[PDB]
Structure formats: structure tokens, C-alpha cells
């Protein structure tokens, strides 16, 4: 769970859609925006900042 959902790097992937998403950055302890390509993403990838915050707040 936490390793994948909160600690993984953001993954844009190979597909060329521009899906605005959020990921948790444990070095900053905040959720930040990134653009997901749409395919084969990892779990640190949230539709809204609030979900990212709920999922990961406090993680180191």
C-alpha cells in the first residue's frame, strides 16, 4: 500500500493523452500536479488533490 500509493515516483507512461493528475511527493510532504499519458500508470496517481491528501498525508 504506502510504498505504491505514496512513495512511488509519478509515472507519465507512453500513451499521449494529457490527463491532469496528482501525486504525493514524500520529500515535500505535499501533493503535486502532473500529467498522465493515460496508460499503464502506477498507484501514486489521483484524480483530485483532496484524494491524494487523504491517501498520503504524513507519509515519509
Amino acid at each position: 500500500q504506502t510504498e505504491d500509493y505514496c512513495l512511488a515516483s509519478n509515472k507519465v507512461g507512453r500513451c499521449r493523452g494529457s490527463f491532469p493528475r496528482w501525486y504525493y511527493d514524500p520529500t515535500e510532504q505535499i501533493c503535486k500536479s502532473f500529467v498522465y499519458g493515460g496508460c499503464l500508470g502506477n498507484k501514486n496517481n489521483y484524480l483530485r488533490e483532496e484524494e491524494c491528501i487523504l491517501a498520503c498525508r504524513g507519509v515519509q
Binding site: 507519465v12 507512453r14 500513451c15 499521449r16 494529457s18 490527463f19 491532469p20 493515460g38 499503464l40
Partner: protein, 241 residues
């Protein structure tokens, strides 16, 4: 589009911008008749958080030049009635990456909105031919989009070279277009938009659909596109076009 330049107003009147609810521009598409668009299947897949396959969640902008000017004269806004993804689409290999989108009401043809021609089923876009990719996607991998539609001139790459450059990844539904020297390519935000090819009468035909890539604009890593000719009959079966 990495390495492109601003499109002229009216230059690609078939280019369409697709916006998902609360999310702005996600994918391009191409107008092929008053009622239908071609786009990429991987744009319209439901996930854990949002129903991208649900046609009510999208708005298409036709006749758009600048994403910051969506109420400019000649911009037409449309809801979608239907999204038809290719029944063989694989969301893991990206094989058969093509979708048909039905507009909720017809587009009105104008100096800014006009369909692209579709190639017949037996047509071959030859290796080396210069063609155009267009879109509002990133101007660098991991970088920011373009307000003004970008155009980039790229070249059809030999299928064998394509397969060797991207091993275990290319199927016969796919075509590599770009430059082995890199520098010009489609990128995130361009998916679903058309390749535009000038044909023997000077009219423009769609050569394929922006699909995927390993990064963008890298050496020996050209963009990969869904072929159009082999889907001609499927498009006719589904749309009458």
C-alpha cells in the same frame, strides 16, 4: 507537439479538442463527417475514479485555434452522444487504438470547421513521405502544453526499422512516424489527433491517429500511430461514412 510551430488559423479545420469534465483538454480527434470524429481508444477508458467511456462527460471543441479563446467566432462546442472503442483495443499493448465519437448535434461546416478525407482501405502511406501531426499537447516530454495549436512535419518510417527500434512493441495496426534524429514528435495531449497527409489532388487525408511513444522527440524513438486504411470498413460499418 515537440519541435513544431504555430498552426495558421483555418489550417487544420478537422482538428478537434476533447475536454473531460473538470479536467480541460485531454485528447485530440478529427472530424470526418457532420456527426462523427475519429480519436484514440485509450482516451476513453473507465478507471477507478472517472468514467472516461461515458459520452456525457466530454465536450468537443471544433474550429478551435487557441485554448484560451474558446468562444472566438467560429468555435463550435458539442457534446457527445456516443463513444465506440475498437472491440479489439488492448489497454496494455495499445493494439487497435482507435475510437469513433458521435456528436450530439451536427457540426456546421465553415472556413474553420471541415472534415478530413479518409483513405481507402487499400491505400499505403509510403515510407519517407512527409506528413503533419497537429495538437495542443506538450512541447517537451514532462513539460507544458501549447495554447495555440501546433503543427509538426514528420516522416513515415519503415515498419521493419520501427519494430527494431521498439522491440516487442509494434503490431501491424501501428505505424512509426517522426525522425530517427528525433527533435520533432507528438507528445502528451496530442493523442487521438490526426496525421494529415497531402494527397495526389492536393487534398488532405488522414494517415493515422496519435497513439503513444517512448518519451517524446528522442533519437531513434519516433512517435507511434494507429493506421487508418485498415479501419476504413470498420468506420463505414459503424458510421456510414
Amino acid at each position: 507537439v515537440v519541435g513544431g510551430t504555430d498552426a495558421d488559423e483555418g489550417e487544420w479545420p478537422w482538428q478537434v479538442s476533447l475536454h473531460a469534465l473538470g479536467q480541460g483538454h485531454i485528447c485530440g480527434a478529427s472530424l470526418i463527417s457532420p456527426n462523427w470524429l475519429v480519436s484514440a481508444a485509450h482516451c476513453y477508458i473507465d478507471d477507478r475514479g472517472f468514467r472516461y467511456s461515458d459520452p456525457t462527460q466530454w465536450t468537443a471543441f471544433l474550429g478551435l485555434h487557441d485554448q484560451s479563446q474558446r468562444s472566438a467566432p467560429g468555435v463550435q462546442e458539442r457534446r457527445l452522444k456516443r463513444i465506440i472503442s475498437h472491440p479489439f483495443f488492448n489497454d496494455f499493448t495499445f493494439d487497435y487504438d482507435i475510437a469513433l465519437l458521435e456528436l450530439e448535434k451536427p457540426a456546421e461546416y465553415s472556413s474553420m470547421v471541415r472534415p478530413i478525407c479518409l483513405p481507402d482501405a487499400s491505400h499505403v502511406f509510403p515510407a519517407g513521405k512527409a506528413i503533419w501531426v497537429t495538437g495542443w499537447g506538450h512541447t517537451q516530454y514532462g513539460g507544458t502544453g501549447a495554447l495555440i495549436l501546433q503543427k509538426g512535419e514528420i516522416r513515415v518510417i519503415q515498419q521493419t526499422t520501427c519494430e527494431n527500434l521498439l522491440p516487442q512493441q509494434i503490431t501491424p495496426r501501428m505505424m512509426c512516424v517522426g525522425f530517427l534524429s528525433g527533435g520533432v514528435d507528438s507528445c502528451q495531449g496530442d493523442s487521438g489527433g490526426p496525421l494529415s497527409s497531402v494527397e495526389a489532388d492536393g487534398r488532405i487525408f488522414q494517415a493515422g491517429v496519435v497513439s503513444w511513444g517512448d518519451g517524446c522527440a528522442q533519437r531513434n524513438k519516433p512517435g507511434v500511430y494507429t493506421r487508418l486504411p485498415l479501419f476504413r470498413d470498420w468506420i463505414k460499418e459503424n458510421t456510414g461514412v
